[PDB]
Amino acid sequence: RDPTQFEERHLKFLQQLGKGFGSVEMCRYDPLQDNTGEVVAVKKLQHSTEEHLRDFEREIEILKSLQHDNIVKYKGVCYSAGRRNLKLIMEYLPYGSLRDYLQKHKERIDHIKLLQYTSQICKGMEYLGTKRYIHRDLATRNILVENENRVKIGDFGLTKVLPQDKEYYKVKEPGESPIFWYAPESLTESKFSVASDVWSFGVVLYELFTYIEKSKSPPAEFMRMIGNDKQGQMIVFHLIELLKNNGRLPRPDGCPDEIYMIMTECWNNNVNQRPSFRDLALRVDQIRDNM
Numbered sequence: 001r002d003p004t005q006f007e008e009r010h011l012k013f014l015q016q017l018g019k020g021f022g023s024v025e026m027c028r029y030d031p032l033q034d035n036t037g038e039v040v041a042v043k044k045l046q047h048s049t050e051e052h053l054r055d056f057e058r059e060i061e062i063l064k065s066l067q068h069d070n071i072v073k074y075k076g077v078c079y080s081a082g083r084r085n086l087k088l089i090m091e092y093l094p095y096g097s098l099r100d101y102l103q104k105h106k107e108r109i110d111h112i113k114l115l116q117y118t119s120q121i122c123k124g125m126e127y128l129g130t131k132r133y134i135h136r137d138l139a140t141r142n143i144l145v146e147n148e149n150r151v152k153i154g155d156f157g158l159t160k161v162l163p164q165d166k167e168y169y170k171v172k173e174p175g176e177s178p179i180f181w182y183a184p185e186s187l188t189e190s191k192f193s194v195a196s197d198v199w200s201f202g203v204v205l206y207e208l209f210t211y212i213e214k215s216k217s218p219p220a221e222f223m224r225m226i227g228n229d230k231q232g233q234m235i236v237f238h239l240i241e242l243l244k245n246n247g248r249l250p251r252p253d254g255c256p257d258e259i260y261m262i263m264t265e266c267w268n269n270n271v272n273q274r275p276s277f278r279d280l281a282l283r284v285d286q287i288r289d290n291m
């Protein structure tokens with residue numbers, strides 16, 4: 001009677017979609033048992049410790065609270081008897097992650113298409129910031145492709161809510177951290193804000209324009225600039241020194257000046273000088289209009 005309530009016994013596994021904490025599978029919700037049910041994407045924990053369950057239930061409320069064309073749609077939850085393990089049910093977006101999709105098609109996706117995706121990602125992020133959420137993991141691997149004309153922000157597993165009276169959230173004991181997408185103040189002080197998401201957005205724009213070429217990925221390029229001999233915590237030390245001296249990812253081969261300019265503006269050491277996602281969406285739509 002309530003379609004946000006999914007009974008797990010009727011979720012049929014179809015295939016694994018990704019692993020990151022969590023796993024996403026494609027399932028058919030098939031309560032008539034005749035293979036006609038809806039196909040959905042299902043997120044669950046690999047280690048459902050009490051601490052993880054708690055964070056996961058907050059992630060689910062975050063997603064449930066977001067309604068936007070460029071944010072994946074929440075469908076419901078599955079609850080288990082007893083220990084109360086949880087599965088998050090979302091729409092299945094059939095072209096998969098933007099990182100996989102662009103790696104697969106490469107330059108057959110032209111600049112016009114790349115800037116349409118850019119604009120949509122900007123708009124999803126602008127909307128997220130109106131709720132005072134900080135994504136913390138904006139990367140093409142977390143953006144999903146609905147069809148050739150539409151992408152959506154597709155995972156919120158590191159997303160935090162800003163304190164009422166602060167414009168940043170400080171992470172006291174960091175877990176796995178995608179340091180190659182992090183703003184300098186996130187690396188030095190574990191401070192995350194709208195402005196650190198904007199820094200990561202400039203890294204997303206870099207990914208798009210390199211077409212996910214492996215040798216050109218943010219980890220490969222930063223490791224090259226700090227030296228491939230650096231390891232473990234020394235990578236973070238040398239990355240902090242590099243970014244303080246204005247070491248930056250290079251201009252991608254073939255990248256339009258106006259786009260490259262946006263990236264480098266997102267990567268300002270001065271937090272206040274980074275652009276807003278409101279203004280990025282305006283600028284990117286003007287660029288698109290110009291083309």
Ligand SMILES: Cc1ccc(Cl)cc1-c1[nH]c(-c2ccnc(N)n2)cc1C(N)=O
Pocket residue numbers: 017018019020022023024041072090091092093094096097141142143144154155
């Ligand atoms: C984006 C993402 C983040 C974390 C995890 Cl655990 C899985 C995914 C993921 N999700 C999907 C996916 C694919 C299709 N629809 C939906 N809603 N999700 C693919 C992948 C992937 N990694 O390639």
